[PDB]
Amino acid sequence: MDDIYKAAVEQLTEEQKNEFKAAFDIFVLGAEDGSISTKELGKVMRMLGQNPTPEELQEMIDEVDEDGSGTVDFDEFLVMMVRSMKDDSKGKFKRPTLRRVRISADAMMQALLGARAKGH
Ligand X SMILES: Cc1cccc(Nc2ccccc2)c1
Contact set with ligand X (CB under 6 A): 36, 41, 44-45, 60-61, 63-64, 72, 77, 80-81, 84, 102-103, 108
The CA distance from 41 to 24, in Å, is 10
Nearer to ligand X by Cβ, of 21 and 120: the residue is 21
Minimum distance from residue 84 beta carbon to ligand X (Å):
5
Residue 71 counted as an annotated binding residue: yes
On the 0-12 / 13-18 / 19+ scale of CB atoms within 10 A, 95 is exposed
Tell how many helices (H) and how many strands (E) occur in the chain.
6, 0
Q: How crowded is residue 73: how many other Cβ atoms within 10 Å of its Cβ? A: 18
C-alpha 37/C-alpha 61 separation (Å) is 8
Closer CB to ligand X, residue 7 or residue 98? 98
14 is in an annotated binding site: no
Q: For residue 72, what are the β-bridge partners?
A: 36
Has 76 been labeled as part of a binding site?
Answer: yes
Q: Is 19 one of the annotated binding-site residues?
A: no
Query: In this complex, which beta carbon is closest to ligand X, that of residue 26 or of residue 60?
Result: 60
In the complex with ligand X, the residue whose CB is nearer, 26 or 64, is: 64
Q: Which residues are annotated as a binding site?
A: 65, 67, 69, 71, 76
Q: Which residues are annotated as a binding site for Ca(2+)?
A: 65, 67, 69, 71, 76
